[PDB]
Amino acid sequence: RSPGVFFDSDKGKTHSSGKVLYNARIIPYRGSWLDFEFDPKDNLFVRID
DNA sequence: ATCGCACGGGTGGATAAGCGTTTACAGTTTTCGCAAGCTCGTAAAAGCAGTATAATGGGAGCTGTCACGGATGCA
């Protein structure tokens, strides 16, 4: 996979809703990763590595 | 021819026993030969204590992403 930023989604991870959760993701050549993501309350979250 | 029969001589035959001669199958004596084991000696291996300018908090390349259920365990 090429480095850079990459946006995707999931279809049916939370089965009790049926909603779509979008996530952003920065991928470097060398270093830590950095994900942004949504949750079924429409809040924005961050997990590093 | 031709041939037995007999008295008797010579023997062959069956054990048996004889003779001097050169090695067995019994048992010990002798010497020589080389070890396997013990004792030893020391040069090598093995182990131990110390070294006084000053020195004071890792991360160390890890993980790169699969997704589905059950039980667990806080809240």
PDB file of N, CA, C and O in Angstrom, chain A:
ATOM      1  N   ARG A   1       0.828  -1.195   0.000  1.00  0.00           N
ATOM      2  CA  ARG A   1       0.000   0.000   0.000  1.00  0.00           C
ATOM      3  C   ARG A   1       0.864   1.247   0.000  1.00  0.00           C
ATOM      4  O   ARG A   1       1.870   1.319   0.706  1.00  0.00           O
ATOM      5  N   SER A   2       0.457   2.230  -0.785  1.00  0.00           N
ATOM      6  CA  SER A   2       1.210   3.466  -0.856  1.00  0.00           C
ATOM      7  C   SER A   2       0.978   4.290   0.406  1.00  0.00           C
ATOM      8  O   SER A   2      -0.121   4.268   0.964  1.00  0.00           O
ATOM      9  N   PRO A   3       1.990   5.007   0.888  1.00  0.00           N
ATOM     10  CA  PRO A   3       1.795   5.886   2.047  1.00  0.00           C
ATOM     11  C   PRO A   3       0.905   7.076   1.717  1.00  0.00           C
ATOM     12  O   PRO A   3       0.590   7.364   0.564  1.00  0.00           O
ATOM     13  N   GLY A   4       0.497   7.779   2.765  1.00  0.00           N
ATOM     14  CA  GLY A   4      -0.394   8.909   2.604  1.00  0.00           C
ATOM     15  C   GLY A   4      -1.680   8.737   3.380  1.00  0.00           C
ATOM     16  O   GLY A   4      -1.771   7.859   4.239  1.00  0.00           O
ATOM     17  N   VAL A   5      -2.684   9.552   3.086  1.00  0.00           N
ATOM     18  CA  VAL A   5      -3.943   9.523   3.816  1.00  0.00           C
ATOM     19  C   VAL A   5      -4.952   8.720   3.004  1.00  0.00           C
ATOM     20  O   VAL A   5      -4.875   8.637   1.773  1.00  0.00           O
ATOM     21  N   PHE A   6      -5.876   8.076   3.709  1.00  0.00           N
ATOM     22  CA  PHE A   6      -6.757   7.088   3.110  1.00  0.00           C
ATOM     23  C   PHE A   6      -8.056   7.047   3.899  1.00  0.00           C
ATOM     24  O   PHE A   6      -8.026   6.869   5.117  1.00  0.00           O
ATOM     25  N   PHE A   7      -9.186   7.192   3.207  1.00  0.00           N
ATOM     26  CA  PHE A   7     -10.506   7.237   3.829  1.00  0.00           C
ATOM     27  C   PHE A   7     -11.314   6.027   3.390  1.00  0.00           C
ATOM     28  O   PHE A   7     -11.359   5.709   2.200  1.00  0.00           O
ATOM     29  N   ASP A   8     -11.967   5.368   4.341  1.00  0.00           N
ATOM     30  CA  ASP A   8     -12.780   4.200   4.040  1.00  0.00           C
ATOM     31  C   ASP A   8     -13.982   4.198   4.978  1.00  0.00           C
ATOM     32  O   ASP A   8     -14.240   5.176   5.684  1.00  0.00           O
ATOM     33  N   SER A   9     -14.725   3.096   4.982  1.00  0.00           N
ATOM     34  CA  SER A   9     -15.897   2.955   5.831  1.00  0.00           C
ATOM     35  C   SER A   9     -16.141   1.475   6.063  1.00  0.00           C
ATOM     36  O   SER A   9     -15.539   0.620   5.414  1.00  0.00           O
ATOM     37  N   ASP A  10     -17.026   1.181   7.005  1.00  0.00           N
ATOM     38  CA  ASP A  10     -17.485  -0.180   7.220  1.00  0.00           C
ATOM     39  C   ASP A  10     -18.992  -0.268   7.015  1.00  0.00           C
ATOM     40  O   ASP A  10     -19.719   0.711   7.205  1.00  0.00           O
ATOM     41  N   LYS A  11     -19.450  -1.442   6.592  1.00  0.00           N
ATOM     42  CA  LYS A  11     -20.863  -1.690   6.320  1.00  0.00           C
ATOM     43  C   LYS A  11     -21.323  -2.853   7.191  1.00  0.00           C
ATOM     44  O   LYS A  11     -21.119  -4.020   6.841  1.00  0.00           O
ATOM     45  N   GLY A  12     -21.951  -2.537   8.319  1.00  0.00           N
ATOM     46  CA  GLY A  12     -22.460  -3.564   9.202  1.00  0.00           C
ATOM     47  C   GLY A  12     -21.474  -4.038  10.247  1.00  0.00           C
ATOM     48  O   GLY A  12     -21.333  -5.243  10.476  1.00  0.00           O
ATOM     49  N   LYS A  13     -20.781  -3.100  10.888  1.00  0.00           N
ATOM     50  CA  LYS A  13     -19.973  -3.421  12.057  1.00  0.00           C
ATOM     51  C   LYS A  13     -20.805  -3.358  13.331  1.00  0.00           C
ATOM     52  O   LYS A  13     -20.694  -4.238  14.193  1.00  0.00           O
ATOM     53  N   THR A  14     -21.650  -2.342  13.456  1.00  0.00           N
ATOM     54  CA  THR A  14     -22.644  -2.261  14.520  1.00  0.00           C
ATOM     55  C   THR A  14     -23.967  -2.789  13.967  1.00  0.00           C
ATOM     56  O   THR A  14     -24.663  -2.111  13.206  1.00  0.00           O
ATOM     57  N   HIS A  15     -24.305  -4.021  14.351  1.00  0.00           N
ATOM     58  CA  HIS A  15     -25.435  -4.716  13.748  1.00  0.00           C
ATOM     59  C   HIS A  15     -26.768  -4.235  14.299  1.00  0.00           C
ATOM     60  O   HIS A  15     -27.786  -4.318  13.604  1.00  0.00           O
ATOM     61  N   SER A  16     -26.781  -3.722  15.532  1.00  0.00           N
ATOM     62  CA  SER A  16     -28.023  -3.275  16.149  1.00  0.00           C
ATOM     63  C   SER A  16     -28.528  -1.961  15.567  1.00  0.00           C
ATOM     64  O   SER A  16     -29.674  -1.580  15.832  1.00  0.00           O
ATOM     65  N   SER A  17     -27.702  -1.259  14.794  1.00  0.00           N
ATOM     66  CA  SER A  17     -28.116  -0.048  14.098  1.00  0.00           C
ATOM     67  C   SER A  17     -28.219  -0.258  12.591  1.00  0.00           C
ATOM     68  O   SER A  17     -29.261   0.022  11.989  1.00  0.00           O
ATOM     69  N   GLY A  18     -27.155  -0.760  11.969  1.00  0.00           N
ATOM     70  CA  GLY A  18     -27.068  -0.768  10.522  1.00  0.00           C
ATOM     71  C   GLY A  18     -26.525   0.516   9.936  1.00  0.00           C
ATOM     72  O   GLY A  18     -26.842   0.851   8.791  1.00  0.00           O
ATOM     73  N   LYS A  19     -25.714   1.245  10.694  1.00  0.00           N
ATOM     74  CA  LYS A  19     -25.179   2.536  10.290  1.00  0.00           C
ATOM     75  C   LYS A  19     -23.848   2.354   9.568  1.00  0.00           C
ATOM     76  O   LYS A  19     -23.293   1.255   9.497  1.00  0.00           O
ATOM     77  N   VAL A  20     -23.338   3.454   9.019  1.00  0.00           N
ATOM     78  CA  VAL A  20     -22.051   3.481   8.337  1.00  0.00           C
ATOM     79  C   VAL A  20     -21.103   4.357   9.144  1.00  0.00           C
ATOM     80  O   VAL A  20     -21.440   5.499   9.480  1.00  0.00           O
ATOM     81  N   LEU A  21     -19.924   3.825   9.455  1.00  0.00           N
ATOM     82  CA  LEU A  21     -18.911   4.535  10.226  1.00  0.00           C
ATOM     83  C   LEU A  21     -17.709   4.787   9.333  1.00  0.00           C
ATOM     84  O   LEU A  21     -17.119   3.841   8.805  1.00  0.00           O
ATOM     85  N   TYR A  22     -17.343   6.055   9.176  1.00  0.00           N
ATOM     86  CA  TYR A  22     -16.238   6.462   8.323  1.00  0.00           C
ATOM     87  C   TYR A  22     -14.978   6.640   9.153  1.00  0.00           C
ATOM     88  O   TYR A  22     -15.039   7.095  10.297  1.00  0.00           O
ATOM     89  N   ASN A  23     -13.834   6.286   8.574  1.00  0.00           N
ATOM     90  CA  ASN A  23     -12.560   6.409   9.265  1.00  0.00           C
ATOM     91  C   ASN A  23     -11.511   7.014   8.345  1.00  0.00           C
ATOM     92  O   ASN A  23     -11.455   6.693   7.157  1.00  0.00           O
ATOM     93  N   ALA A  24     -10.691   7.895   8.901  1.00  0.00           N
ATOM     94  CA  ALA A  24      -9.535   8.451   8.218  1.00  0.00           C
ATOM     95  C   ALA A  24      -8.269   7.839   8.792  1.00  0.00           C
ATOM     96  O   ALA A  24      -8.236   7.425   9.951  1.00  0.00           O
ATOM     97  N   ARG A  25      -7.216   7.803   7.985  1.00  0.00           N
ATOM     98  CA  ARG A  25      -6.042   7.024   8.357  1.00  0.00           C
ATOM     99  C   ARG A  25      -4.827   7.560   7.629  1.00  0.00           C
ATOM    100  O   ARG A  25      -4.832   7.634   6.399  1.00  0.00           O
ATOM    101  N   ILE A  26      -3.787   7.913   8.373  1.00  0.00           N
ATOM    102  CA  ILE A  26      -2.537   8.398   7.807  1.00  0.00           C
ATOM    103  C   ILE A  26      -1.499   7.295   7.940  1.00  0.00           C
ATOM    104  O   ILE A  26      -1.285   6.765   9.036  1.00  0.00           O
ATOM    105  N   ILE A  27      -0.863   6.948   6.827  1.00  0.00           N
ATOM    106  CA  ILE A  27       0.101   5.860   6.751  1.00  0.00           C
ATOM    107  C   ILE A  27       1.440   6.441   6.316  1.00  0.00           C
ATOM    108  O   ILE A  27       1.543   6.987   5.216  1.00  0.00           O
ATOM    109  N   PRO A  28       2.481   6.369   7.134  1.00  0.00           N
ATOM    110  CA  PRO A  28       3.799   6.826   6.695  1.00  0.00           C
ATOM    111  C   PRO A  28       4.666   5.708   6.142  1.00  0.00           C
ATOM    112  O   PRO A  28       4.297   4.533   6.201  1.00  0.00           O
ATOM    113  N   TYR A  29       5.833   6.067   5.609  1.00  0.00           N
ATOM    114  CA  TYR A  29       6.823   5.059   5.253  1.00  0.00           C
ATOM    115  C   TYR A  29       7.497   4.492   6.487  1.00  0.00           C
ATOM    116  O   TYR A  29       7.832   3.305   6.533  1.00  0.00           O
ATOM    117  N   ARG A  30       7.725   5.337   7.482  1.00  0.00           N
ATOM    118  CA  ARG A  30       8.486   4.973   8.664  1.00  0.00           C
ATOM    119  C   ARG A  30       7.966   5.823   9.806  1.00  0.00           C
ATOM    120  O   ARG A  30       8.138   7.043   9.792  1.00  0.00           O
ATOM    121  N   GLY A  31       7.320   5.197  10.766  1.00  0.00           N
ATOM    122  CA  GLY A  31       6.812   5.901  11.915  1.00  0.00           C
ATOM    123  C   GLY A  31       5.487   5.327  12.338  1.00  0.00           C
ATOM    124  O   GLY A  31       5.022   4.326  11.803  1.00  0.00           O
ATOM    125  N   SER A  32       4.874   5.981  13.318  1.00  0.00           N
ATOM    126  CA  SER A  32       3.618   5.510  13.873  1.00  0.00           C
ATOM    127  C   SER A  32       2.465   5.780  12.914  1.00  0.00           C
ATOM    128  O   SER A  32       2.539   6.638  12.036  1.00  0.00           O
ATOM    129  N   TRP A  33       1.385   5.040  13.101  1.00  0.00           N
ATOM    130  CA  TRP A  33       0.165   5.262  12.345  1.00  0.00           C
ATOM    131  C   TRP A  33      -0.759   6.177  13.139  1.00  0.00           C
ATOM    132  O   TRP A  33      -0.526   6.462  14.314  1.00  0.00           O
ATOM    133  N   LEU A  34      -1.813   6.655  12.481  1.00  0.00           N
ATOM    134  CA  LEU A  34      -2.713   7.622  13.106  1.00  0.00           C
ATOM    135  C   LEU A  34      -4.087   7.481  12.471  1.00  0.00           C
ATOM    136  O   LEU A  34      -4.285   7.889  11.325  1.00  0.00           O
ATOM    137  N   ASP A  35      -5.028   6.912  13.214  1.00  0.00           N
ATOM    138  CA  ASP A  35      -6.384   6.693  12.739  1.00  0.00           C
ATOM    139  C   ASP A  35      -7.342   7.684  13.384  1.00  0.00           C
ATOM    140  O   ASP A  35      -7.303   7.898  14.598  1.00  0.00           O
ATOM    141  N   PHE A  36      -8.197   8.281  12.566  1.00  0.00           N
ATOM    142  CA  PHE A  36      -9.386   8.972  13.028  1.00  0.00           C
ATOM    143  C   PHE A  36     -10.579   8.093  12.699  1.00  0.00           C
ATOM    144  O   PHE A  36     -10.556   7.354  11.716  1.00  0.00           O
ATOM    145  N   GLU A  37     -11.621   8.168  13.516  1.00  0.00           N
ATOM    146  CA  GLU A  37     -12.751   7.278  13.303  1.00  0.00           C
ATOM    147  C   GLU A  37     -14.000   7.861  13.938  1.00  0.00           C
ATOM    148  O   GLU A  37     -13.934   8.767  14.770  1.00  0.00           O
ATOM    149  N   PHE A  38     -15.141   7.331  13.516  1.00  0.00           N
ATOM    150  CA  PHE A  38     -16.440   7.648  14.078  1.00  0.00           C
ATOM    151  C   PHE A  38     -16.940   6.472  14.905  1.00  0.00           C
ATOM    152  O   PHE A  38     -16.391   5.369  14.863  1.00  0.00           O
ATOM    153  N   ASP A  39     -18.001   6.722  15.658  1.00  0.00           N
ATOM    154  CA  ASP A  39     -18.669   5.737  16.492  1.00  0.00           C
ATOM    155  C   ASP A  39     -20.161   6.009  16.386  1.00  0.00           C
ATOM    156  O   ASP A  39     -20.558   7.099  15.959  1.00  0.00           O
ATOM    157  N   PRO A  40     -21.037   5.024  16.762  1.00  0.00           N
ATOM    158  CA  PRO A  40     -22.488   5.216  16.557  1.00  0.00           C
ATOM    159  C   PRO A  40     -23.185   6.337  17.326  1.00  0.00           C
ATOM    160  O   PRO A  40     -24.408   6.461  17.226  1.00  0.00           O
ATOM    161  N   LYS A  41     -22.458   7.146  18.096  1.00  0.00           N
ATOM    162  CA  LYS A  41     -22.986   8.386  18.643  1.00  0.00           C
ATOM    163  C   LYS A  41     -22.513   9.604  17.864  1.00  0.00           C
ATOM    164  O   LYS A  41     -22.731  10.733  18.317  1.00  0.00           O
ATOM    165  N   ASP A  42     -21.856   9.384  16.718  1.00  0.00           N
ATOM    166  CA  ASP A  42     -21.311  10.431  15.838  1.00  0.00           C
ATOM    167  C   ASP A  42     -20.294  11.323  16.548  1.00  0.00           C
ATOM    168  O   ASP A  42     -20.255  12.535  16.335  1.00  0.00           O
ATOM    169  N   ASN A  43     -19.458  10.722  17.389  1.00  0.00           N
ATOM    170  CA  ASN A  43     -18.307  11.402  17.962  1.00  0.00           C
ATOM    171  C   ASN A  43     -17.049  10.984  17.213  1.00  0.00           C
ATOM    172  O   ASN A  43     -16.991   9.909  16.616  1.00  0.00           O
ATOM    173  N   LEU A  44     -16.043  11.847  17.243  1.00  0.00           N
ATOM    174  CA  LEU A  44     -14.795  11.612  16.535  1.00  0.00           C
ATOM    175  C   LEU A  44     -13.744  11.106  17.512  1.00  0.00           C
ATOM    176  O   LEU A  44     -13.554  11.690  18.580  1.00  0.00           O
ATOM    177  N   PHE A  45     -13.055  10.029  17.143  1.00  0.00           N
ATOM    178  CA  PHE A  45     -12.092   9.382  18.019  1.00  0.00           C
ATOM    179  C   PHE A  45     -10.731   9.279  17.339  1.00  0.00           C
ATOM    180  O   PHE A  45     -10.598   9.456  16.128  1.00  0.00           O
ATOM    181  N   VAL A  46      -9.710   8.989  18.143  1.00  0.00           N
ATOM    182  CA  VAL A  46      -8.313   8.923  17.714  1.00  0.00           C
ATOM    183  C   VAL A  46      -7.658   7.726  18.385  1.00  0.00           C
ATOM    184  O   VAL A  46      -7.727   7.590  19.610  1.00  0.00           O
ATOM    185  N   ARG A  47      -7.011   6.867  17.601  1.00  0.00           N
ATOM    186  CA  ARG A  47      -6.109   5.870  18.156  1.00  0.00           C
ATOM    187  C   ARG A  47      -4.784   5.929  17.418  1.00  0.00           C
ATOM    188  O   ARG A  47      -4.752   5.889  16.186  1.00  0.00           O
ATOM    189  N   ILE A  48      -3.698   6.033  18.174  1.00  0.00           N
ATOM    190  CA  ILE A  48      -2.344   6.032  17.639  1.00  0.00           C
ATOM    191  C   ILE A  48      -1.778   4.631  17.804  1.00  0.00           C
ATOM    192  O   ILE A  48      -1.784   4.093  18.916  1.00  0.00           O
ATOM    193  N   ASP A  49      -1.306   4.042  16.695  1.00  0.00           N
ATOM    194  CA  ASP A  49      -0.716   2.693  16.646  1.00  0.00           C
ATOM    195  C   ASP A  49      -1.681   1.618  17.137  1.00  0.00           C
ATOM    196  O   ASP A  49      -1.268   0.644  17.771  1.00  0.00           O
TER     197      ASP A  49
END
